[PDB]
A paper describes a structure:
[name], a validated target for B-cell malignancies, presents a reactive cysteine (C481) in the ATP binding pocket of the kinase domain that has been co-opted for the development of potent covalent inhibitors, including approved therapeutics such as ibrutinib. As a starting point for our work, we selected an irreversible covalent degrader (referred to throughout this study as [name]-[name]-Covalent degrader ([name])), from a previously disclosed series built from an Ibrutinib-like [name] warhead fused to a known ligand of the IAP family of E3 ligases. Here, we present a study of an irreversible-covalent degrader ([name]) of [name] as the target, and [name] as the E3 ligase. We, therefore, set out to expand our understanding of target recruitment within the framework of covalent degraders targeting [name] and co-opting [name].
Numbering used by the authors: 260 to 351
The structure:
């Protein structure tokens, strides 16, 4: 089931990044697209579906690749990217 139903829509997730720190090299649009919303502390984000949390984002980090690497069984990630994409990331 969905861990945080209130954050299931892209527009609700985007609102959470209003005060996302400027020096973070990963943008709200990319994080929100991958299911992540900002919890309001440093650069901590969580997936609305699996509740997986990620922080300390680096330049070049791809939110979809990170979602597949750390949280492969997420239903949202599998529905958006497909099991084939997840399997490829998991295999590397
Ligand atoms: Zn997830």
């Amino acid at each position: 089931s969905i861990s945080n139903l209130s954050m299931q829509t892209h527009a609700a997730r985007m609102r959470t990044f209003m005060y996302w720190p400027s020096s973070v090299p990963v943008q709200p649009e990319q994080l929100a697209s991958a299911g992540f919303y900002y919890v309001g502390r440093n650069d901590d984000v969580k997936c609305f579906c699996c509740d997986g949390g990620l922080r300390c984002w680096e330049s070049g980090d791809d939110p979809w690749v990170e979602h597949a690497k750390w949280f492969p069984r997420c239903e949202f990630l599998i529905r958006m990217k497909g099991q084939e994409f997840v399997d490829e990331i998991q295999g590397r």
